[PDB]
Design an enzyme around this catalytic site. Structure first.
Site, mmCIF file in Angstrom:
data_model
loop_
_atom_site.group_PDB
_atom_site.id
_atom_site.type_symbol
_atom_site.label_atom_id
_atom_site.label_comp_id
_atom_site.label_asym_id
_atom_site.label_seq_id
_atom_site.Cartn_x
_atom_site.Cartn_y
_atom_site.Cartn_z
ATOM 1 N N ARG A 20 61.850 48.424 -31.754
ATOM 2 C CA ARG A 20 61.571 47.417 -32.794
ATOM 3 C C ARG A 20 61.929 47.983 -34.162
ATOM 4 O O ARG A 20 62.552 47.320 -34.979
ATOM 5 C CB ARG A 20 60.103 46.997 -32.785
ATOM 6 C CG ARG A 20 59.681 46.288 -31.495
ATOM 7 C CD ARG A 20 58.180 46.153 -31.417
ATOM 8 N NE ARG A 20 57.568 47.472 -31.267
ATOM 9 C CZ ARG A 20 56.271 47.735 -31.408
ATOM 10 N NH1 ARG A 20 55.410 46.779 -31.714
ATOM 11 N NH2 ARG A 20 55.840 48.979 -31.235
ATOM 12 N N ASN A 38 57.523 43.024 -28.940
ATOM 13 C CA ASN A 38 57.422 43.330 -27.507
ATOM 14 C C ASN A 38 56.780 42.168 -26.767
ATOM 15 O O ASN A 38 55.905 41.476 -27.326
ATOM 16 C CB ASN A 38 56.545 44.578 -27.278
ATOM 17 C CG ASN A 38 57.185 45.865 -27.731
ATOM 18 O OD1 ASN A 38 56.484 46.841 -28.025
ATOM 19 N ND2 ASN A 38 58.492 45.915 -27.749
#
Length: 95
Positions: A20, A38
């Site tokens: 990320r 996620n």
């Protein structure tokens, strides 16, 4: 002067590898807005918005590179569409 949005979901070894962080960094570098998160099936998902060529570069990055320790099996893109204006003013890690 054409802006698009596209949804993405990345399959592979994509968790526990700072995916990320790296996605946000690369999106920002490319002048994109959107988000990354996620999912509960172990993937990374989000949306990208911006000029077509910039979105396409990011789509390629999401197919072959991602974060250094990652192994990407597949990037699924969905809901690609022209937009009137950006829905986001930054690229957020949703976490």
């Amino acid at each position: 002067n054409t802006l698009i949005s596209v949804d993405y979901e990345i399959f592979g070894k994509v968790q526990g590898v700072f995916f990320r962080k790296h996605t946000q960094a690369e999106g920002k570098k490319l002048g994109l807005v959107g988000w990354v998160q996620n999912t509960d099936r172990g993937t990374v998902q989000g949306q990208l918005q911006g000029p077509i060529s910039k979105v396409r570069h990011m789509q390629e990055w999401l197919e072959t590179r991602g974060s250094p320790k990652s192994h990407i099996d597949k990037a699924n893109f969905n809901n690609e569409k022209v937009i009137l204006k950006l829905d986001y003013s930054d690229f957020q890690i949703v976490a």
